[PDB]
Each structure stands twice: as C-alpha cells, then as structure tokens.
Amino acid sequence: IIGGEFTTIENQPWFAAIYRRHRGGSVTYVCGGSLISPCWVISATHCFIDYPKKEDYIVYLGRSRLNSNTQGEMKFEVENLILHKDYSADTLAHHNDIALLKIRSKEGRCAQPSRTIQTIALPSMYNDPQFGTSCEITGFGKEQSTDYLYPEQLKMTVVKLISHRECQQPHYYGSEVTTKMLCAADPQWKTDSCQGDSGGPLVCSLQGRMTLTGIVSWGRGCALKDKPGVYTRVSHFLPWIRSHTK
Numbered sequence: 001i002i003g004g005e006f007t008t009i010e011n012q013p014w015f016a017a018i019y020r021r022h023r024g025g026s027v028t029y030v031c032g033g034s035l036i037s038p039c040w041v042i043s044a045t046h047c048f049i050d051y052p053k054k055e056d057y058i059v060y061l062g063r064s065r066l067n068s069n070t071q072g073e074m075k076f077e078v079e080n081l082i083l084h085k086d087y088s089a090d091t092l093a094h095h096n097d098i099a100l101l102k103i104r105s106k107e108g109r110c111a112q113p114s115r116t117i118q119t120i121a122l123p124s125m126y127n128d129p130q131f132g133t134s135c136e137i138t139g140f141g142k143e144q145s146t147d148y149l150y151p152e153q154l155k156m157t158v159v160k161l162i163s164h165r166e167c168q169q170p171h172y173y174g175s176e177v178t179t180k181m182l183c184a185a186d187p188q189w190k191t192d193s194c195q196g197d198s199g200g201p202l203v204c205s206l207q208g209r210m211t212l213t214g215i216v217s218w219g220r221g222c223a224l225k226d227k228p229g230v231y232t233r234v235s236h237f238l239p240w241i242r243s244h245t246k
C-alpha cells in the first residue's frame, strides 16, 4: 500500500496473510486474501499459478504484523488450492484472477470467528457500487515502488471506483481492462495498492453493508498518474465461487 495508514487486524478482520514455505525452511509473504466463510479464503490465481503445490502455503487470520504473532491470530494450511481454469496473463492484464483456498488448522478445523477474525460478505449479482464511491484496500504490499521489502505492519487506504469507460481511455489501460475488471485509484494518484497487495480485498460499503467488491489483481507501476489499480470484479464470479465452495 502506497500512502494510506498503518492499521491492525481488528479494523480488517476478514484479511488473510498468505505465505509460502521454501526448501530449506524459509517462509516469505506471497499475497493477501479474504475470509468469505470459515473454511474459505478468496485470493488471486496469479499469486499461486507458478507454485501450485497447496502443501507449501501458510495462511494466517487475525494477524496484524508481517513477521510477528498477533494476539488471537490463527494459522492454517491449505486443504484445497483452487485456481481459475481460465486464468491467463497478458503484458499487463490478468484474466480470471481469482482463487479459492480451503483452509484447515492442524486439528482439521476451519476459522473460528472472533473480534479479530470475521467473514466479509460477498456482493450480490449485477449490483456493484457506482463510479466515484470510496472503497478501502488492505495489505502488506510495498509502500514505494522502489522498495524491495514489505512493511512490517499492515496498511490500509481508501480509493475511488473508476468507471469502465474512463479506465478504457488510451492514457489509462485502453481495451486491456475488461468489464470483468474494476478500476480504482486516488484522484490525486498519491495512494494505491502495489506489489504484495495482490489477492487482497477491495471492500465497498453498499446500501450500508460492507462487501468484497474486488480482489487486488494488477496495475502499471503503483500510484502512477492515469494508471489505476485493477481489481477482479467479484460480482461476475459469484457462479464460479458458489460452484467451487461446495
């Protein structure tokens, strides 16, 4: 997250912190994710496509720091890593950039809802918020494009939804951004999601209710002028989510 503010997991209790185990025992942060039901975390396929071995991943719920244990955090393995069969990557655009992670503790249980661990409601079909609506993003991603390390503390920011027509303008992404993608940025281009925030939530308040409107997917640079953050539009994927969670 470029700009924005440091936060803690109690303000984002659906946020999942996903890491990968390496040969030799080192574990590095991969991507964010969101708890949509006690057994299921929703993230982005590009996060896992080059390393699709479910056994390598660790997911945390109720965790506020990158390399520290948060009081009340819960650790899980991935029982099932489901990547979208039609995921593809162009030079910039990532297609069908959605994934599901069935989580389990070492005792074989799913998440236990608490003050710092909660689900995020899925959106309804054909009912996304209008362009101009402010939404929040969360992640452990870079604070500057030039950084090679991630912040130790979780961050959050607020961005505004950009219409498909604006995002398809030639100085923006042209025909590379599709109707299955949602653009969101800062009108002053000072705050954004960045590398490391992929898979994480774009949460919008719709008719007074908090919803997982998007999933961090792709963008040209970070907080660059006319280069919005591009998010997987979750409302298009409700038939796919419902079919793979049962």
Ligand SMILES: COc1ccc2ccc(C(=N)N)cc2c1OCC(N)=O
Pocket: 192, 193, 194, 195, 196, 197, 198, 216, 217, 218, 219, 220, 221, 222, 223, 224, 227, 228, 229, 230
């Ligand atoms: C691999 O790096 C990523 C991966 C995912 C991203 C996702 C979103 C954004 C954004 N500008 N909001 C930037 C991202 C990003 O940085 C853009 C880049 N490397 O040019």
